[PDB]
């Protein structure tokens, strides 16, 4: 006995490119035997932070779906990725539910997601009409209205383009470097399914 199909975690964690936080992607992991012990024992991950279900308990408890929400955020902003937190990333870009069951994986990515001259290809939303609901993948790009006067669809006074650039540099502190993130929000539903742990069969 053995696994039938290893889950595409390599496709997510080791992805060639990672999207901005305001347009965070979501890979619907489905119908596969997941090995989480390989992820936990890795020494690269600077933050695992499992919620609800303990990390070692994962390898014999299993669910209907697993969504690997992924984005890039500087290190000090990582704490906002959690239930009940508040902040620019929590309010305007990515809000986790107050009741949550996942594991916010992260790792340093200075050598990949940055270069000598810096990088401006990552964006984040700085203004919005109101707070996000949980898992609200809002990819709005319209000019934000900050007042009563109309903005005329163009930048100006009381009108700011909602997405600003992180703009990293290799000289930034370790807490300010680009840390990739993967969330792994588990789910149950009326339909049974078995995205589940390894066989563990010694024989």
């Amino acid at each position, epitope marked *: 006995p053995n696994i039938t199909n290893l889950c595409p975690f390599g496709e997510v964690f080791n992805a060639t490119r990672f999207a901005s936080v305001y347009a965070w992607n979501r890979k619907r992991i489905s119908n596969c035997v997941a090995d989480y012990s390989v992820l936990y024992n890795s020494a690269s991950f600077s933050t695992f932070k499992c919620y609800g279900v303990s990390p070692t308990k994962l390898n014999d408890l299993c669910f209907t779906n697993v969504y690997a929400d992924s984005f890039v955020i500087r290190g000090d902003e990582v704490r906002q990725i959690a239930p009940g937190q508040t902040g620019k990333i929590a309010d305007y870009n990515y809000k986790l539910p107050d009741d949550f069951t996942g594991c916010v994986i992260a790792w*340093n990515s200075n050598n990949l997601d940055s270069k000598v001259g810096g990088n401006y290809n990552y964006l984040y939303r700085l203004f919005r009409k109101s707070n996000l609901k949980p898992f609200e993948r809002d990819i709005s790009t319209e000019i934000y209205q900050a007042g009563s006067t109309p903005c005329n669809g163009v930048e100006g006074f009381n009108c700011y383009f909602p997405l600003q650039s992180y703009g990293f540099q290799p000289t930034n502190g370790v807490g300010y470097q680009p840390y990739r993130v993967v969330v792994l929000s588990f789910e149950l539903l009326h339909a049974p399914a078995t995205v589940c742990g390894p066989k563990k069969s010694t024989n």
Partner: antibody, heavy 131, light 113 residues
Framework: QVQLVQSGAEVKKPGASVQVSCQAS????????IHWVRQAPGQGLEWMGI????????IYAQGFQGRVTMTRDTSLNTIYLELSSLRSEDTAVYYC????????????????????????WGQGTLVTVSS | DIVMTQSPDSLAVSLGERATINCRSS????????????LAWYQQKPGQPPKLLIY???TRESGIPDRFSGSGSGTDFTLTISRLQAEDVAVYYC?????????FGQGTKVEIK
């Protein structure tokens, strides 16, 4: 009965390797992170890195990204340095400051969030380098 | 990178009086979710390692007497030592644990009379 001690004073040549380390009671330091703090005699404190003791996930300051690697030993729960390319600026004391994780919500480790503050420090291990 | 410098480099304190140690951060350490100001205050005597006094912005850690006190929010914070009578001459460090790399302060020496 002091419950945190270091490996004692060390001396090394420039370009050599140094293994300042501190062994501690594993009964309580499975669930506490542990940092490393530098201080020159004339200057203030400086930061070097954080080690989650069991897993060994590590983060280093940008100033010493390519000069230090830190290991573990789950049996003893002791942690070491590998500070290399020693120079006159490297003469300093090295405390393996502890942390207390505040939140009971999340399981697992987080080197960016669950650090909080330095509740306990080790005795000084003064390192000197000379020709 | 949460750079930091205390306003008072060194202060001469008359014995038994109250002395304040202002401590300014470059970036606000206040976190909106729980509204706890992330600073802690340390003191090291010569030779001995530093000892924490106040772990959040205000509340003092167990085992220390109630002589010390700290208050403030945002970026302006102060350590107020009251009735400086014992031999508490030392260098006082305030440091952020809001984000890495934990930039400690340069430290200020307190002197008696």
């Amino acid at each position: 009965q002091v419950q945190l001690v270091q490996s004692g004073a060390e001396v090394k040549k420039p370009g050599a390797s140094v293994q300042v380390s501190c062994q501690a009671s594993a009964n309580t330091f499975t669930n506490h992170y542990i940092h490393w703090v530098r201080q020159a005699p004339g200057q203030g404190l400086e930061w070097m890195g954080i080690i989650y003791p069991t897993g060994g996930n590590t983060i280093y300051a940008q100033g010493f990204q390519g000069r230090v690697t830190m290991t573990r030993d789950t049996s003893l729960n002791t942690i070491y340095l590998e500070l290399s390319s020693l120079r006159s600026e490297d003469t300093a004391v090295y405390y393996c400051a502890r942390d207390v994780r505040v939140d009971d919500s999340w399981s697992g480790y987080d080197l960016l969030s669950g650090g909080t503050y330095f509740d306990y420090w080790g005795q000084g291990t003064l390192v000197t380098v000379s020709s | 990178d949460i750079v930091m410098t205390q306003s008072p480099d060194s202060l001469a304190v008359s014995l038994g009086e109250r002395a304040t140690i202002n401590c300014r951060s470059s970036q606000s350490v206040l976190y909106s979710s729980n509204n706890e100001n992330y600073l802690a205050w340390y003191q090291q005597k010569p030779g001995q390692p530093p000892k924490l006094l106040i772990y959040w912005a205000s509340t003092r850690e167990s085992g220390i007497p109630d002589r010390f006190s700290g208050s403030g929010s945002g970026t302006d914070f102060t350590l107020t030592i009251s009735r400086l009578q014992a031999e508490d001459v030392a260098v006082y460090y305030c440091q952020q644990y809001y984000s890495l790399p934990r930039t400690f302060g340069q430290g200020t020496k307190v002197e008696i009379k």
